[PDB]
Amino acid sequence: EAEVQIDRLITGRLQSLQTYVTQQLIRAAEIRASANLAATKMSECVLGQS
Amino acid sequence: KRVDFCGKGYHLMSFPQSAPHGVVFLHVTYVPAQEKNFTTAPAICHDGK
C-alpha cells in the first residue's frame, strides 16, 4: 500500500508542476511581445526621427 | 521611411521569394562611404543681412 500512497502523492505534485509550467509559458510570451515593441521603439526613435 | 525596418541603411526596393513554409525578402539598400572633413558654417553675412 506504500505504492498506492506514493501514486497519490506523485499525481498531485505532477499536476501542480504542469500548471506552473503553463502559466510560465504564457507570461514569457507576453514579455516577448513587450520586448519586441521596446526594440522597435528604440531602433526607430533613437537612431532617427519619428 | 522608418529606419532599420527593412535592411540596414537607406531603403530603395525589395523582392519577395517563396519557401517551403515561409517567405524570403531580398532588400536593396544604399550606403555611403569615402568621407572627407571640410570646414562648415551656419550662415553667411553680407551687407548686414
Please give the full DSSP string across A1-50, using - where no structure is assigned: -HHHHHHHHHHHHHHHHHHHHHHHHHHHHHHHHHHHHHHHHIIIIISS--
Phi, psi values for residue B21, rounded to 5°: -140, 40
| Residue B2 CB neighbour total at 10 angstroms | 13
Flag if A47 and B3 touch (Cβ within 8 Å).
yes
* Dist CA A32 CA A16 (whole Å): 25
Name the one residue in this structure whose C-alpha cell is 503553463: A22
B8 touches chain A (CB under 8 A): no
Q: What resolution (Å)?
A: 3.5
CA distance A50 to chain B (A): 7
The experimental method, as deposited, was: cryo-EM
Phi, psi values for residue A23, rounded to 5°: -60, -40
* Beta bridge partner(s), residue B17: B24
Q: Are strands B22-30 and B10-19 parallel, antiparallel or unpaired?
A: antiparallel
